[PDB]
Symmetry: C2
Subunit: 270 residues, 2 copies
């Protein structure tokens, strides 16, 4: 049961260039300088509470409890999220993260048991709110990876083709210090879980989807971003990120390939 | 004959930032030193990384052309060993400088031919102090099917730590050192492409475990020198042992191995 509702924790970190350089390298972009804007979604490389091995489950994620309760028989799912952008976080600075457990509601779909937990992350630099983030976590019982169709790649207003490889996936796990083995352990992700190969991270592709929008709408100032996973992408299959404009300051983004869409997302901007 | 690199020098800088320090500590299951406390021995190997964009990376996941070390003409560049000399600890939280000098480049024709031996010196300075000086021995070897027999016997010592590595441990160390060399995490590559039986436990990873154990077994010893030589690759998830034995008032050896032989040995000197 969840009495965790309304629980807060505080975390601090330094947006240190040495680590920003690593994210930059991973994405093949330039390393922002001291005092400049940390690019969208790069903050996910920060505010990491690494867990000692004994606190980890077989899947390499933390089984141990902490801010959130423990999980063994279930498995966390990166269901989605909404980000509200105010100000860039600036490289070099200290920054603070205030986290709140907002909702913990039980639900039912395929496989039935489906506990949804929503977390809010408030990110402050110099006391000043830079970014407010909610993340959807779904605890479910292990089921083999879903089969069946998904939506096709729509035609859109911009598009980028990407050729993943294990080195790209390793660097992104590295930068986020994610120990989830589905992203680098090929014997495990195939034999133990049902996948045909390595899984491209949801955050990694969220970051490429959001970056292709900004690239294509260079005069657009971000306001809001929402993403939702659909079906996992499999390395090394080439895939694609793209989107389209929908209304006044509203755009939709998507990641997918021939197997169909892996992720969809909504953007608001000025 | 090798003047273009002999004497080459370069200075870099880096902050010994706690966020990365927390990830090293988690990897090793240890406490995180506080800001201003000693960086634990050999944790500096995670710092001073100037990583290349993907286009700069070669197939094996290392950078395709580093500009300091002599180019490997499709030869395999091995981490043969090195020597460290500890003067003062590097401190968590602070800026530090690494000055690097290529000391020696020698071609030597032995059994199996001539490979390239290169000796690289690294000098670390923080708050105006010369904290630590180090040398790496690199050995450029022709691409050869992995030789995995172990020649030296794992001895019995004064202490012993049994280790069962797994791909999570190897990933986290590669992560913390932003090492893209994919023989450490990419199982289809390390086997199909390079022909190891499986993933390779990093030499640096092994040395830190080796020195750590000695420290655990000798808590009053303050480090002054450490030398290590890599003997043979270790293969995840082989169970292996780190041990050592005191040899004299401030001398001890350490080693890494298992029933098949020593994977790595080294020498310690302390007060």
């Amino acid at each position: 049961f969840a009495p965790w509702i309304g629980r807060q924790e505080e975390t601090h970190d330094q947006l240190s260039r040495n680590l920003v350089k690593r994210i930059a390298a991973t994405f093949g972009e330039p390393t922002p300088a001291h005092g400049e804007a940390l690019p969208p979604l790069w903050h996910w490389a920060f505010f990491q509470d690494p867990v000692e091995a004994a606190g980890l489950g077989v899947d390499g994620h933390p089984a141990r409890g902490g801010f959130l309760p423990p999980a063994d028989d279930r498995n966390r799912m990166w269901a989605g999220g909404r980000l509200e952008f105010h100000q860039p976080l600036r490289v070099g600075g200290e920054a603070s993260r205030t986290s709140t457990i907002l909702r913990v509601e039980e639900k039912h779909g395929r496989s039935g048991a489906l506990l949804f937990v929503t977390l809010r992350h408030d990110y402050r630099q110099d006391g000043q709110l830079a970014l407010s983030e909610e993340h959807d976590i779904v605890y479910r019982e292990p089921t083999p990876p879903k089969l069946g169709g998904t939506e096709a790649l729509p035609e859109g207003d911009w598009r980028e083709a990407l050729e993943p490889d294990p080195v790209l996936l390793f660097r992104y796990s590295a930068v986020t210090f994610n120990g989830h083995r589905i992203h680098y352990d090929w014997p495990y992700v195939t034999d133990a879980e049902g996948y045909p190969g390595l899984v491209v991270h949801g955050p990694l592709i969220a970051t490429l989807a959001l970056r292709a929008f900004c690239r294509a709408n260079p005069q657009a100032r971000l306001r809001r971003f929402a993403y939702r996973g659909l079906r996992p992408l499999i390395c090394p299959e080439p895939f694609e990120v793209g989107g389209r404009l929908l209304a006044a300051g509203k755009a939709e983004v998507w990641v997918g390939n021939g197997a169909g869409l892996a992720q969809r997302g909504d953007v608001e901007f000025d």
